[PDB]
Amino acid sequence: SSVCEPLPPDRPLWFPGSSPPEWLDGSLPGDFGFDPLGLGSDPDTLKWFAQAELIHSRWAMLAVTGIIIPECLERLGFIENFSWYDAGSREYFADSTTLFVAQMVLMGWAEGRRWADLIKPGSVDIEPKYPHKVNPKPDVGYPGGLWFDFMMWGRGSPEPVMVLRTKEIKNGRLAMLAFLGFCFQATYTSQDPIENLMAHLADPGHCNVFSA
Amino acid sequence: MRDLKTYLSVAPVLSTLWFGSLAGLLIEINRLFPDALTFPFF
Amino acid sequence: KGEWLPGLASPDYLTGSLAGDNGFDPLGLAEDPENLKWFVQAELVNGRWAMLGVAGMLLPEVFTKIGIINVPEWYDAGKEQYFASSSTLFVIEFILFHYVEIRRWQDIKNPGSVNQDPIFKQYSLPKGEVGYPGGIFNPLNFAPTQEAKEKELANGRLAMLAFLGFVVQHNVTGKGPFENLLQHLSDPWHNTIVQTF
Amino acid sequence: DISGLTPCKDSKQFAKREKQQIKKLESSLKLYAPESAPALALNAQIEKTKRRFDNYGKYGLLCGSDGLPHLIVNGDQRHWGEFITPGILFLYIAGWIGWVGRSYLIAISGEKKPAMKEIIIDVPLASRIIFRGFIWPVAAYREFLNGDLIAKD
Ligand code: CLA
Ligand code: CLA
Ligand SMILES: CC(/C=C/C=C(C)/C=C/[C@@]12O[C@]1(C)C[C@@H](O)CC2(C)C)=C\C=C\C=C(C)\C=C\C=C(C)\C=C\[C@@]12O[C@]1(C)C[C@@H](O)CC2(C)C
16 A cells, blocks of 8 residues: 555656666656666665755745746736745845844754754654554655645555655656746746746747747 | 766865865955955954 | 754764763764763863853843843953952962862862862762762752753753853944843844844 | 054055055056946955055054064064964864864774775765864864874884
């Protein structure tokens, strides 16, 4: 039920007809053999890179959400003067430098607990114990937990665990690329992402990157 | 990447990385605090 | 006894026997056991002196502000005129600190060496552990249980950083500690270190 | 006023040196348009020069008959910032380095072929050893008292 079964060797690859490398057997989610350079050779380092991909993708997903959804609300008439690449320069309280150090303190606690999970899995355990009940030992990056799996979707309730982790990773790789598009086309157009979408959808031919 | 971290661990690659970082540090300090001849901060 | 960074393991030289042993030795200083039993004493004495210092440079200020008793603010307290000179205090604080600190030195060198008076040879001290003399240093006779030693070292580690905070909140701020606390409680998000610099 | 040196905020030759360098920069500033980028760089250098001379004025530097900041390295407190406060800041940092590279050499001393870690530095081991030398003076002190600082052959 909850085993994290891998993908088969005859799985879809990033490049059909190509040989997948031997260090991408399929144990990780979203394994399509993408390794033209082979940065995940050492498996002790490929674990760290899988955790890197997972956290990078989760942050990129929350970020693309926090960029496009609030812009949809601005178009609906909820938020004023919204522009994500100028939303750090605009005014708040706490000067944006007290906010930074408070952020570093709180995220240092959080990401330090996550780091202690990465170095040694059982150190910072949560989901407190109960009498005559066994909380299952989780994996790194997928802690389960009362705080991060309160709907119990991680152990494989609606779908298997491998396909759900692959959903996370694929949706999140797409979000990572979406945020790269945000960081690039908000500086080479000096405009809004949703505005750029509607502008390309107006005339897809001539409203492309080559106009600028 | 296996055996690239061993190459980057080698004495000249590691020395150029350390001294590039260190030289950039000194360079940016001298941009921030140029023309220094005393330590007045106590 | 506990752990300061759960991702890290307590080193082999910190077996949890000592008081305050949360396993904090990332820089491997107390790796030799002689260094460990010397730095236990250095911690205890710096922490006890820091507790006395903080209590003697903060409690004057929380009583000056509320007006119960007016007293200087620990940095203008040297320039005040006392019944002796500015150096006579240093002479006395040398004469009768050399004696008490060298006797503590002889204690932390060999424990059972220095426990009786030079003058009144009968009034000895009980055989307590090193850094915890007892006897006339325990007149109310509160027991030196391990929980009490842990409480001592915790308040002392806190008072050490409190003194450091005082020195750096007068070095690059110019004002006193409690005034800085009231300035923080006035507007916490606008009266911090990242506004002074 | 030690060693027969007037201070630099009071030395007329120091201000004359300032004015000479500033005029030498301004004579190179006339050839460029006042809004152009070389002119702005020259003006930034001019303000750098002016505040450099002001800072050598305010930091207690002593100027001789030639009108140049001399360093009094003897031990006078007024000029500790010229030699001793940097000097300790050297002996710390330098003693960081030697206490690190020594400690590393002791940590790779017990290997089979310990020479292939001299040319191929263990970055994890070196990063563990690097911050050991942060508070190096107490480690060196205690190792001197424990005899671990000097090999016994
Ligand atoms: C934070 C970035 C990041 C990281 C660390 C990983 C890490 C990993 N990926 Mg994932 N991946 C990512 C982003 C990332 N990915 C994105 C954005 C995509 C979509 C484009 C994919 C698509 C993908 C597929 C399809 C597959 C993987 C696989 C893997 C594994 C092997 C590759 C490896 O070790 O690379 C380590 C990578 C890095 C250390 C980052 C590279 C950093 C260097 C400096 C280059 C960066 C510049 C870049 C080229 C700029 C883009 C330019 C733009 C024009 C496109 C490993 C777990 C394989 C796997 O087994 O899945 C689990 C697999 O089949 N990835
Ligand atoms: C050995 C002889 C010698 C000496 C004593 C000096 C001394 C100096 N030179 Mg000269 N120089 C020399 C040889 C020498 N130089 C040679 C051989 C050349 C040709 C290559 C030059 C070319 C040269 C130029 C072109 C310039 C200097 C400058 C300087 C000054 C350096 C200011 C600076 O950036 O430091 C600032 C301090 C640092 C960079 C050290 C920072 C170290 C880091 C941050 C760690 C410190 C913190 C640490 C953690 C401890 C904190 C304590 C605790 C909290 C832990 C200083 C007076 C500059 C100057 O101002 O002119 C006077 C300048 O412009 N020198
Ligand atoms: C003794 C002490 C203070 C004593 C203060 C006194 C008497 C004050 C007296 C006065 O104010 C009054 C009463 C009244 C004023 O009128 C006069 C004065 C004179 C001004 C402070 C110690 C203060 C000591 C401090 C701040 C020490 C901090 C040490 C730290 C943080 C160590 C960290 C680590 O060493 C460990 C723990 C383990 C390693 O492995 C890793 C690292 C990280 C290296």
